[PDB]
Amino acid sequence: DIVMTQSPDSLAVSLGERATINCKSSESVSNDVAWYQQKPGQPPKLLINYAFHRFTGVPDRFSGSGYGTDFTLTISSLQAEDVAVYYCHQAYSSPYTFGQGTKLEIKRTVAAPSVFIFPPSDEQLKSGTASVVCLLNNFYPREAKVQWKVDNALQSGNSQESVTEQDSKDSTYSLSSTLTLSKADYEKHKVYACEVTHQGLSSPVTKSFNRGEC
Amino acid sequence: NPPTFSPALLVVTEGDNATFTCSFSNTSESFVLNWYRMSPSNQTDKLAAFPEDRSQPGQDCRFRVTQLPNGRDFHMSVVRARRNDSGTYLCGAISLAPKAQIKESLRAELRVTE
Amino acid sequence: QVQLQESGPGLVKPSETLSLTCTVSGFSLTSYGVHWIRQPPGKGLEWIGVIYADGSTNYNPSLKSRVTISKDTSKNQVSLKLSSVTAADTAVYYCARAYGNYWYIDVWGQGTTVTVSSASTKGPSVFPLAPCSRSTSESTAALGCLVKDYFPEPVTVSWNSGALTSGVHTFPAVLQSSGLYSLSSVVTVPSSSLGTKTYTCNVDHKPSNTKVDKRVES
Ligand SMILES: *[C@@H]1O[C@H](CO)[C@@H](O)[C@H](O)[C@H]1NC(C)=O
Ligand SMILES: *[C@@H]1O[C@H](CO)[C@@H](O)[C@H](O)[C@H]1NC(C)=O
Ligand SMILES: *[C@@H]1O[C@H](CO)[C@@H](O)[C@H](O)[C@H]1NC(C)=O
């Protein structure tokens, strides 16, 4: 068949700069290549058609060039709402294959997280499991260390993290860490502290709450 | 140095053949032409190319593009034009030069009546 | 308003026959070809097939004979049927329109997600997330609700039926040791607005037909 190969696999460029993604075909394809952007959870949306033409209604900073086997998507002045995955697609010979996709993430200034902690809901402790959750809001870069301490007993492996994609307004991440315990283990102790270290803080941040004192 | 698409408007009557002329500064002599039809919402449809590419997904004998022996210009013809065909048409030239620009012509209108 | 909406089972057991429908608005299927495209989780887009304007079909050879694409123009509907499925077939399925002679894909449906599993469907339980210490000196307050122990994907979470969207983060679903999915959805508000406005999160889960509006105020 025909394989489209994109370059690079992922790409981090600062705001206002120019971003280029390349797509190359195994068999020559004569300009029947379209560029689509897709953000998490929504369908792909068409950016460029016929290798050069800017689709109707897509901003002026998106442009396409190339023909035969080499094609380039170029965003001129990259801004925050363009963080996405980009796919080339050939409509030349069946099967009409896609590129593997290039994730375009943007590079940003440092931003410290806003820290919150939530105790397990009262309706959840009857069911016999207690999940205490710690939330980090609007930080950058993505590397941050969240540490659970129960009466200064540091929990090692009963927590999970999950991170949003870079926000299309301010280009920050948010992270949520869920610490799961049995109900007996949860009401066996009294102090819960989420401590988070990130480059945007002068010192580690600890936020806590006492058992049942809600 | 872009190509030019003429005439600005031609009318034919629910049939026959309708042909336009697209002229270009054939510098490099190693390039491609596309012939597009732009919907009322500025959306473009690629009708043909010289040289021809593939007849699979792009199958429509209705639109021929032929090269004239003088080399400067090309005939863009719609054969037996249905009333669906009436609309705004445009020419486009692309040079395979390492920049691979797409020089782009002006709109041209086509009607079908009677 | 050129629109495509997919519908189909959120759960199919392995070796079944999987059937999806794509209802079309804003154009007629006689003049436009419709493609089916597929996206596994975290993987790329894979082209499944196409039914052209006339009616001739064309599929991806990797789907040697398990795939069948048909259409009914009277209902403005295009249907995809894929036989003898395996866990390699769980993915999001999009229908999409091909535009123009010498075509390109312009308008995509919203895609419907299909999971292939022998396992049984299970609806989520939703719990409120409010701070233990009611805010005092805290200028900004954060609320949320934890959607836990559901299968399969996907679960949608809105806040106040879509009236509150700015500053909402719903995290991607994460898989637990139980083999079940769990996510949380948080929202950031000024703490002055805690005593006046009530915040209810609206979670729903399609495969289990689960609908819940949970109060968050604590
Ligand atoms: C119209 O176009 C085709 C090909 O150029 C030709 O067969 C036909 O005779 C043409 N002219 C007329 C008058 O039909
Ligand atoms: C372009 O120019 C060359 C001479 O410069 C001419 O022979 C040719 O017919 C034109 N087009 C092509 C396809 O070469
Ligand atoms: C126009 O309608 C459709 C496509 O627009 C086509 O099937 C039909 O043959 C065309 N002819 C006329 C006379 O409308």
Coordinates of C-alpha atoms and ligand atoms in Angstrom, one line a residue:
Chain A
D1 CA 0.0 0.0 0.0
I2 CA 1.1 3.6 0.6
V3 CA 2.6 4.7 3.9
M4 CA 2.7 8.3 4.9
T5 CA 5.5 9.1 7.4
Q6 CA 5.4 12.3 9.5
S7 CA 8.3 14.0 11.1
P8 CA 8.8 14.6 14.0
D9 CA 6.7 12.3 16.2
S10 CA 6.2 15.1 18.8
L11 CA 7.1 18.7 18.7
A12 CA 7.4 21.5 21.3
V13 CA 7.7 25.1 20.1
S14 CA 7.3 28.3 22.0
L15 CA 4.3 30.7 21.4
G16 CA 4.4 33.0 18.4
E17 CA 7.2 31.0 16.7
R18 CA 6.8 28.9 13.6
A19 CA 6.0 25.2 13.6
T20 CA 6.6 22.9 10.6
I21 CA 5.5 19.2 10.3
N22 CA 6.6 17.2 7.4
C23 CA 4.9 14.2 5.7
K24 CA 6.5 12.0 3.1
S25 CA 4.9 9.3 0.9
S26 CA 6.4 5.9 -0.1
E27 CA 4.7 6.0 -3.5
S28 CA 4.5 9.3 -5.3
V29 CA 1.1 11.0 -4.6
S30 CA 0.3 14.1 -6.8
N31 CA -1.0 16.7 -4.3
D32 CA -4.0 14.7 -3.0
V33 CA -2.9 15.2 0.6
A34 CA -5.0 16.9 3.3
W35 CA -3.8 18.1 6.7
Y36 CA -6.2 17.7 9.7
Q37 CA -5.8 18.8 13.3
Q38 CA -7.4 16.8 16.1
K39 CA -7.6 17.7 19.8
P40 CA -8.4 15.1 22.5
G41 CA -12.1 14.2 22.6
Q42 CA -13.2 16.0 19.5
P43 CA -13.2 14.8 15.8
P44 CA -10.3 15.8 13.5
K45 CA -10.9 19.1 11.7
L46 CA -9.6 19.8 8.2
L47 CA -6.8 22.4 7.9
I48 CA -5.3 22.1 4.4
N49 CA -6.6 20.5 1.2
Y50 CA -4.9 19.7 -2.1
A51 CA -1.5 20.1 -0.4
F52 CA -1.5 23.9 -0.7
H53 CA -5.1 25.2 -0.3
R54 CA -6.1 26.6 3.1
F55 CA -9.5 25.2 3.8
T56 CA -12.4 27.6 4.1
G57 CA -12.6 29.2 7.5
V58 CA -9.3 28.1 9.0
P59 CA -6.9 30.9 10.2
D60 CA -4.3 32.5 8.0
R61 CA -1.3 31.2 10.0
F62 CA -1.9 27.7 8.6
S63 CA -0.3 26.9 5.3
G64 CA 0.6 23.9 3.3
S65 CA 3.2 23.2 0.6
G66 CA 4.7 20.3 -1.2
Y67 CA 4.0 17.9 -4.1
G68 CA 4.7 14.3 -5.1
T69 CA 6.2 12.9 -1.9
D70 CA 7.3 15.7 0.4
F71 CA 4.7 18.0 2.1
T72 CA 4.9 20.5 4.9
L73 CA 2.3 21.9 7.2
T74 CA 3.4 25.2 8.6
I75 CA 1.9 27.3 11.4
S76 CA 3.4 30.8 11.1
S77 CA 2.9 32.4 14.5
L78 CA 1.9 29.5 16.7
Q79 CA -0.5 30.4 19.5
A80 CA -2.0 28.5 22.4
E81 CA -5.2 27.2 20.7
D82 CA -3.1 25.1 18.2
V83 CA -1.9 22.4 20.6
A84 CA -3.2 19.2 19.0
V85 CA -2.2 16.2 16.9
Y86 CA -1.7 16.7 13.2
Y87 CA -2.4 14.1 10.5
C88 CA -1.6 14.1 6.8
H89 CA -3.9 12.0 4.7
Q90 CA -3.5 10.9 1.1
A91 CA -6.5 10.4 -1.2
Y92 CA -4.4 9.1 -4.1
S93 CA -4.7 5.3 -4.1
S94 CA -6.7 2.9 -2.0
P95 CA -6.2 2.2 0.9
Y96 CA -6.3 5.9 1.6
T97 CA -3.9 5.9 4.5
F98 CA -3.1 8.5 7.1
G99 CA 0.1 9.6 8.8
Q100 CA 0.9 8.4 12.2
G101 CA 0.2 11.8 13.7
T102 CA 2.5 14.5 15.2
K103 CA 1.6 15.8 18.6
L104 CA 2.3 19.6 18.7
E105 CA 2.7 20.7 22.3
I106 CA 3.9 24.3 23.0
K107 CA 6.7 25.5 25.2
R108 CA 5.7 28.1 27.8
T109 CA 6.9 30.1 30.8
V110 CA 7.1 28.5 34.2
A111 CA 3.8 28.4 36.2
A112 CA 3.3 27.1 39.8
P113 CA 0.3 24.9 40.6
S114 CA -2.6 25.8 42.8
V115 CA -3.0 23.0 45.3
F116 CA -6.2 21.5 46.7
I117 CA -7.2 18.4 48.7
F118 CA -10.6 16.8 49.0
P119 CA -11.4 14.2 51.7
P120 CA -13.5 11.1 50.7
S121 CA -17.2 11.9 50.4
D122 CA -19.5 10.6 53.1
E123 CA -21.5 8.5 50.6
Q124 CA -18.3 6.7 49.6
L125 CA -17.2 5.4 53.0
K126 CA -20.3 3.3 53.4
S127 CA -19.3 1.4 50.3
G128 CA -16.1 0.4 52.1
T129 CA -13.5 2.3 50.1
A130 CA -12.0 5.8 50.7
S131 CA -10.5 7.9 47.9
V132 CA -8.8 11.1 49.1
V133 CA -7.9 13.3 46.1
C134 CA -5.2 16.0 45.5
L135 CA -5.5 18.5 42.7
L136 CA -2.8 20.6 41.0
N137 CA -4.2 23.5 38.9
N138 CA -2.6 25.4 36.1
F139 CA 1.1 24.6 36.2
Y140 CA 3.9 24.3 33.7
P141 CA 6.1 22.5 32.9
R142 CA 4.5 19.1 33.2
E143 CA 7.1 17.6 35.6
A144 CA 5.7 17.8 39.2
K145 CA 6.1 15.5 42.2
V146 CA 3.1 14.8 44.4
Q147 CA 3.7 12.9 47.7
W148 CA 1.1 11.5 50.0
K149 CA 1.7 11.6 53.8
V150 CA -0.7 10.1 56.4
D151 CA 0.5 11.0 59.8
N152 CA 3.9 11.6 58.1
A153 CA 3.7 8.0 56.9
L154 CA 4.6 8.5 53.2
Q155 CA 2.3 6.4 51.0
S156 CA 4.2 4.7 48.2
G157 CA 2.0 2.8 45.8
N158 CA -1.8 3.2 46.4
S159 CA -2.1 6.4 44.3
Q160 CA -2.6 7.2 40.6
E161 CA -2.0 10.5 38.7
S162 CA -3.7 11.7 35.6
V163 CA -3.0 14.8 33.6
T164 CA -5.1 16.9 31.2
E165 CA -3.7 17.9 27.9
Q166 CA -2.2 21.4 27.6
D167 CA -4.9 23.9 28.0
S168 CA -5.8 25.7 24.8
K169 CA -6.2 29.0 26.6
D170 CA -3.0 29.4 28.8
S171 CA -1.0 26.2 27.8
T172 CA -0.8 24.8 31.4
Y173 CA -1.4 21.4 32.7
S174 CA -3.5 20.2 35.6
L175 CA -2.9 16.9 37.5
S176 CA -5.0 14.9 39.8
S177 CA -3.7 12.2 42.2
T178 CA -6.1 9.8 43.8
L179 CA -5.1 7.9 47.0
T180 CA -7.3 4.9 47.6
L181 CA -7.6 3.2 51.0
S182 CA -9.9 0.8 52.8
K183 CA -12.4 2.4 55.1
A184 CA -10.8 1.0 58.2
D185 CA -7.4 2.2 57.1
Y186 CA -8.9 5.6 56.4
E187 CA -10.6 6.1 59.8
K188 CA -7.6 4.5 61.5
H189 CA -5.5 7.7 61.1
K190 CA -6.0 11.5 61.6
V191 CA -3.9 13.7 59.4
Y192 CA -3.7 13.6 55.5
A193 CA -1.3 15.8 53.7
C194 CA -0.6 16.2 50.0
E195 CA 2.8 17.7 49.4
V196 CA 3.7 18.8 45.9
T197 CA 7.1 20.1 44.5
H198 CA 7.3 22.0 41.2
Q199 CA 9.7 24.4 39.6
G200 CA 7.3 27.3 40.1
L201 CA 7.3 27.1 43.9
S202 CA 10.1 28.4 46.2
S203 CA 9.5 25.4 48.5
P204 CA 7.4 22.3 48.5
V205 CA 3.7 23.0 49.2
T206 CA 1.8 20.9 51.8
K207 CA -2.0 21.0 52.1
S208 CA -3.7 18.7 54.6
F209 CA -6.9 17.9 56.6
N210 CA -7.7 16.0 59.8
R211 CA -9.8 12.8 59.8
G212 CA -13.5 13.4 60.4
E213 CA -12.9 17.0 61.5
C214 CA -14.9 18.1 58.4
Chain B
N1 CA 3.9 35.9 -12.8
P2 CA 0.7 33.9 -12.1
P3 CA -1.7 32.4 -14.7
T4 CA -4.8 34.0 -16.1
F5 CA -8.2 32.5 -16.6
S6 CA -10.6 33.7 -19.3
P7 CA -13.3 34.5 -20.3
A8 CA -14.6 36.3 -17.2
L9 CA -18.1 34.8 -18.0
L10 CA -19.5 32.5 -20.6
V11 CA -23.1 31.0 -20.9
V12 CA -24.2 27.8 -22.6
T13 CA -27.6 26.2 -22.9
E14 CA -28.2 22.9 -20.8
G15 CA -25.8 20.9 -23.0
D16 CA -23.1 21.1 -25.6
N17 CA -19.4 21.8 -24.6
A18 CA -18.2 24.8 -22.5
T19 CA -14.5 25.6 -22.6
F20 CA -12.3 28.1 -20.7
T21 CA -8.7 29.1 -21.5
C22 CA -5.9 29.3 -18.8
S23 CA -2.6 30.9 -19.8
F24 CA 0.6 30.6 -17.9
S25 CA 4.3 31.8 -17.9
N26 CA 5.7 28.3 -18.6
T27 CA 9.2 29.2 -17.2
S28 CA 10.6 25.9 -15.6
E29 CA 8.6 23.7 -18.1
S30 CA 8.3 21.0 -15.3
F31 CA 5.0 21.9 -13.5
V32 CA 1.4 20.9 -13.1
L33 CA -2.0 22.7 -13.6
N34 CA -5.1 22.2 -11.5
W35 CA -8.6 23.3 -12.5
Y36 CA -10.9 24.0 -9.5
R37 CA -14.6 24.9 -9.0
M38 CA -15.3 27.0 -5.9
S39 CA -18.6 26.5 -4.2
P40 CA -20.7 29.6 -3.1
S41 CA -19.2 29.1 0.4
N42 CA -15.7 29.7 -0.9
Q43 CA -15.0 25.9 -0.6
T44 CA -12.9 24.5 -3.5
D45 CA -13.4 21.3 -5.5
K46 CA -10.5 20.1 -7.8
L47 CA -11.9 19.3 -11.1
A48 CA -8.9 18.3 -13.2
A49 CA -5.1 18.4 -13.6
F50 CA -2.5 18.5 -16.4
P51 CA -0.9 16.1 -16.5
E52 CA -3.7 13.7 -15.5
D53 CA -3.3 11.7 -12.3
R54 CA -5.6 8.8 -11.4
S55 CA -9.1 7.9 -12.7
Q56 CA -10.1 5.9 -9.5
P57 CA -11.7 8.2 -6.8
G58 CA -11.3 11.1 -9.3
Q59 CA -13.6 9.6 -12.0
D60 CA -15.4 12.1 -14.2
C61 CA -15.0 12.2 -18.1
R62 CA -17.1 15.4 -17.9
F63 CA -14.0 17.6 -17.3
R64 CA -11.2 17.5 -19.8
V65 CA -8.0 19.6 -19.7
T66 CA -6.0 19.6 -22.9
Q67 CA -2.6 21.3 -23.8
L68 CA -2.4 23.3 -26.9
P69 CA 0.6 23.0 -29.3
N70 CA 1.7 26.6 -28.6
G71 CA 2.5 25.7 -25.0
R72 CA 1.5 29.0 -23.3
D73 CA -2.1 28.1 -22.6
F74 CA -4.5 25.2 -22.0
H75 CA -8.2 24.5 -22.6
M76 CA -10.4 23.6 -19.7
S77 CA -13.6 22.0 -21.1
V78 CA -16.8 20.7 -19.5
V79 CA -18.5 18.3 -21.9
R80 CA -22.3 18.3 -22.2
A81 CA -22.8 20.7 -19.3
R82 CA -25.6 19.8 -16.8
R83 CA -27.3 22.6 -14.9
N84 CA -25.6 21.4 -11.8
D85 CA -22.3 22.4 -13.4
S86 CA -23.0 26.2 -13.5
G87 CA -20.8 28.0 -11.0
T88 CA -17.5 29.9 -10.3
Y89 CA -14.3 28.3 -11.7
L90 CA -10.6 29.0 -11.2
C91 CA -7.2 28.0 -12.6
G92 CA -4.1 27.1 -10.6
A93 CA -0.5 26.5 -11.6
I94 CA 2.1 24.7 -9.5
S95 CA 5.9 24.6 -10.2
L96 CA 7.8 21.6 -9.0
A97 CA 10.8 24.0 -8.2
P98 CA 12.2 23.4 -4.7
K99 CA 9.9 26.1 -3.3
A100 CA 6.9 24.3 -5.0
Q101 CA 4.7 27.4 -5.0
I102 CA 1.1 27.3 -6.2
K103 CA 0.5 30.4 -8.3
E104 CA -3.2 31.2 -8.4
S105 CA -5.5 32.8 -11.0
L106 CA -8.7 34.8 -10.8
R107 CA -12.4 33.6 -10.6
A108 CA -14.4 33.0 -13.8
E109 CA -18.2 32.5 -13.9
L110 CA -20.2 30.0 -15.9
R111 CA -24.0 29.8 -16.6
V112 CA -26.3 27.2 -18.2
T113 CA -29.8 28.0 -19.4
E114 CA -32.5 27.6 -22.2
Chain C
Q1 CA -24.9 22.7 8.7
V2 CA -23.3 19.6 7.2
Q3 CA -23.6 17.0 9.9
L4 CA -22.9 13.4 10.5
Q5 CA -23.8 11.5 13.8
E6 CA -22.7 8.0 14.6
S7 CA -24.6 5.5 16.7
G8 CA -24.0 2.0 17.8
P9 CA -23.3 -0.5 20.6
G10 CA -20.9 0.8 23.2
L11 CA -20.1 -2.9 24.1
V12 CA -19.8 -5.9 21.8
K13 CA -18.7 -9.3 22.9
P14 CA -15.8 -10.9 20.9
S15 CA -16.8 -12.7 17.6
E16 CA -20.1 -10.8 17.4
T17 CA -21.0 -8.7 14.3
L18 CA -20.6 -5.0 15.0
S19 CA -23.0 -2.6 13.4
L20 CA -22.8 1.2 13.4
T21 CA -25.0 3.8 11.7
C22 CA -24.2 7.3 10.5
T23 CA -27.2 9.7 10.1
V24 CA -26.6 12.6 7.8
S25 CA -28.0 16.1 7.7
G26 CA -27.2 18.9 5.2
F27 CA -26.6 16.8 2.1
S28 CA -27.9 13.8 0.2
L29 CA -26.0 10.5 0.0
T30 CA -26.5 10.4 -3.8
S31 CA -24.0 13.2 -4.4
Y32 CA -21.4 12.5 -1.8
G33 CA -19.2 9.6 -0.8
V34 CA -19.0 8.6 2.9
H35 CA -15.9 7.1 4.5
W36 CA -15.6 5.1 7.7
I37 CA -12.4 5.8 9.7
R38 CA -11.1 4.2 12.9
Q39 CA -8.9 5.3 15.8
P40 CA -7.7 2.8 18.5
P41 CA -7.0 4.3 21.9
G42 CA -3.8 6.4 21.8
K43 CA -3.1 5.0 18.3
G44 CA -3.4 6.8 14.9
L45 CA -6.2 7.1 12.4
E46 CA -6.9 4.0 10.2
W47 CA -9.0 4.3 7.1
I48 CA -11.7 1.6 7.1
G49 CA -13.6 2.1 3.9
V50 CA -15.7 4.2 1.6
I51 CA -19.1 4.0 -0.1
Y52 CA -19.1 6.3 -3.1
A53 CA -21.9 8.4 -4.6
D54 CA -23.0 5.7 -7.1
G55 CA -22.8 2.9 -4.6
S56 CA -19.6 1.0 -5.4
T57 CA -17.7 0.2 -2.2
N58 CA -14.0 0.1 -1.4
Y59 CA -12.4 -1.2 1.8
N60 CA -9.0 -1.6 3.4
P61 CA -7.4 -4.9 2.5
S62 CA -6.3 -5.6 6.1
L63 CA -10.1 -6.1 6.7
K64 CA -10.0 -8.9 4.0
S65 CA -13.8 -9.8 4.1
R66 CA -15.0 -9.0 7.6
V67 CA -16.2 -5.5 6.6
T68 CA -19.3 -4.4 4.7
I69 CA -20.4 -0.8 4.0
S70 CA -24.0 -0.1 2.8
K71 CA -26.3 2.9 2.7
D72 CA -30.0 3.7 2.6
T73 CA -30.6 7.1 1.0
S74 CA -34.3 7.3 2.1
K75 CA -33.2 7.5 5.8
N76 CA -30.1 9.5 4.9
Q77 CA -28.1 6.7 6.7
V78 CA -24.8 4.9 6.1
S79 CA -24.2 1.6 7.8
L80 CA -21.0 -0.2 8.7
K81 CA -20.9 -3.9 9.6
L82 CA -17.8 -5.7 10.7
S83 CA -17.9 -9.5 11.4
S84 CA -15.9 -11.7 13.7
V85 CA -14.5 -8.9 15.8
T86 CA -11.6 -9.3 18.3
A87 CA -10.1 -7.0 20.9
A88 CA -8.1 -5.5 18.0
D89 CA -11.3 -3.8 16.9
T90 CA -12.1 -1.6 20.0
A91 CA -11.7 2.0 18.9
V92 CA -13.5 5.2 18.0
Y93 CA -15.3 5.0 14.7
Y94 CA -15.9 8.1 12.6
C95 CA -18.0 8.6 9.6
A96 CA -16.9 11.4 7.3
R97 CA -17.9 13.1 4.0
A98 CA -15.6 13.1 0.9
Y99 CA -16.0 16.4 -1.0
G100 CA -15.5 17.1 -4.6
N101 CA -14.3 15.2 -7.7
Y102 CA -10.7 14.3 -6.8
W103 CA -12.0 14.2 -3.3
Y104 CA -10.9 15.1 0.3
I105 CA -12.5 14.5 3.6
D106 CA -14.0 17.7 4.9
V107 CA -16.7 17.1 7.6
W108 CA -16.3 14.4 10.3
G109 CA -18.9 13.0 12.6
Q110 CA -18.3 13.2 16.3
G111 CA -17.3 9.5 16.4
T112 CA -18.7 6.8 18.5
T113 CA -16.5 4.6 20.7
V114 CA -16.9 0.8 20.5
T115 CA -15.3 -1.6 23.0
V116 CA -14.8 -5.3 22.2
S117 CA -14.9 -7.3 25.5
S118 CA -16.3 -10.6 26.9
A119 CA -16.6 -8.7 30.2
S120 CA -19.9 -7.4 31.5
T121 CA -21.0 -3.7 31.5
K122 CA -20.9 -1.8 34.7
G123 CA -22.1 1.7 35.5
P124 CA -20.2 4.2 37.5
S125 CA -20.7 5.6 41.0
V126 CA -20.3 9.4 41.3
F127 CA -19.1 11.0 44.5
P128 CA -18.8 14.7 45.4
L129 CA -15.4 16.4 46.0
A130 CA -15.5 19.4 48.3
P131 CA -12.8 20.7 50.7
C132 CA -12.8 19.5 54.3
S133 CA -12.0 22.9 55.7
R134 CA -14.7 25.2 54.5
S135 CA -12.8 28.1 52.9
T136 CA -12.0 31.1 55.2
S137 CA -8.9 33.0 54.0
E138 CA -8.7 31.1 50.7
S139 CA -9.4 33.5 47.8
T140 CA -10.1 30.7 45.2
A141 CA -12.1 27.5 45.9
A142 CA -12.1 24.2 43.9
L143 CA -15.0 21.7 43.7
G144 CA -15.4 18.5 41.8
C145 CA -16.9 15.0 41.5
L146 CA -15.2 11.6 41.2
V147 CA -16.7 9.2 38.7
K148 CA -15.4 5.8 39.8
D149 CA -15.7 2.1 38.8
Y150 CA -17.3 2.0 35.4
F151 CA -16.8 0.1 32.1
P152 CA -16.5 0.5 29.3
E153 CA -15.7 4.0 27.9
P154 CA -16.8 6.7 27.5
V155 CA -18.3 8.7 30.4
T156 CA -19.4 12.4 29.8
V157 CA -19.3 15.0 32.6
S158 CA -20.7 18.5 32.4
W159 CA -21.3 21.1 35.1
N160 CA -24.7 22.7 35.7
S161 CA -25.9 21.3 32.3
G162 CA -23.3 23.1 30.3
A163 CA -23.8 26.5 31.9
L164 CA -20.5 26.4 33.7
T165 CA -17.6 25.6 31.3
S166 CA -14.8 28.1 31.9
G167 CA -12.1 26.8 34.2
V168 CA -13.4 23.2 34.2
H169 CA -10.9 20.4 34.0
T170 CA -12.2 16.8 33.5
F171 CA -9.2 14.5 33.7
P172 CA -8.7 11.6 31.3
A173 CA -10.0 8.3 32.5
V174 CA -7.4 6.1 34.3
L175 CA -7.6 2.4 34.6
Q176 CA -7.6 0.8 38.1
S177 CA -6.4 -2.4 39.6
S178 CA -10.0 -3.7 39.4
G179 CA -10.0 -3.3 35.6
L180 CA -12.5 -0.5 35.9
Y181 CA -12.2 3.1 34.8
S182 CA -12.2 6.1 37.1
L183 CA -11.8 9.8 36.5
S184 CA -12.5 13.1 38.3
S185 CA -13.9 16.4 37.2
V186 CA -13.0 19.6 39.0
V187 CA -14.0 23.2 38.6
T188 CA -12.4 26.4 40.0
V189 CA -14.6 29.2 41.4
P190 CA -14.2 32.3 43.5
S191 CA -14.9 31.4 47.1
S192 CA -17.3 34.4 47.4
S193 CA -19.6 32.4 45.1
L194 CA -19.8 29.3 47.4
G195 CA -22.7 30.3 49.6
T196 CA -24.8 31.8 46.7
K197 CA -24.4 29.3 43.8
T198 CA -25.1 25.6 43.9
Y199 CA -22.9 23.5 41.7
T200 CA -24.2 20.1 40.4
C201 CA -22.1 17.9 38.2
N202 CA -24.0 15.9 35.5
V203 CA -22.4 12.6 34.7
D204 CA -23.8 10.1 32.2
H205 CA -22.6 6.7 31.0
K206 CA -24.2 5.3 27.8
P207 CA -23.5 1.5 27.8
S208 CA -25.2 1.2 31.1
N209 CA -27.7 4.0 30.5
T210 CA -26.6 5.8 33.7
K211 CA -27.6 9.5 34.4
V212 CA -26.7 11.3 37.6
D213 CA -26.7 14.9 38.8
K214 CA -24.6 15.1 42.0
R215 CA -24.7 18.1 44.4
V216 CA -21.3 19.6 45.3
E217 CA -21.5 22.1 48.1
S218 CA -19.6 20.9 51.2
Ligands
LIG1 C1 -17.6 18.0 -26.8 O1 -16.4 17.3 -26.3 C2 -16.0 16.0 -26.7 C3 -14.5 15.9 -26.6 O2 -13.8 17.1 -26.9 C4 -16.4 15.6 -28.2 O3 -16.5 14.2 -28.3 C5 -17.7 16.2 -28.6 O4 -17.9 16.0 -30.0 C6 -17.4 17.7 -28.3 N1 -18.1 18.5 -29.2 C7 -19.4 18.4 -29.5 C8 -20.0 19.4 -30.4 O5 -20.0 17.5 -29.0
LIG2 C1 6.5 24.1 -21.3 O1 7.6 24.6 -22.0 C2 8.3 23.7 -22.9 C3 9.4 24.5 -23.6 O2 10.0 25.4 -22.7 C4 7.4 23.2 -23.9 O3 8.1 22.3 -24.8 C5 6.3 22.4 -23.2 O4 5.3 22.0 -24.2 C6 5.6 23.2 -22.1 N1 5.0 22.2 -21.2 C7 5.5 21.0 -20.9 C8 4.5 20.0 -20.4 O5 6.7 20.7 -21.1
LIG3 C1 -28.0 17.3 -11.9 O1 -28.4 16.6 -10.7 C2 -27.5 15.5 -10.4 C3 -26.2 16.1 -9.8 O2 -26.3 17.4 -9.3 C4 -27.2 14.6 -11.6 O3 -27.5 13.3 -11.2 C5 -28.1 14.9 -12.7 O4 -27.8 14.0 -13.8 C6 -27.9 16.4 -13.1 N1 -28.7 16.7 -14.3 C7 -29.7 17.6 -14.3 C8 -30.3 17.8 -15.7 O5 -30.2 18.1 -13.3

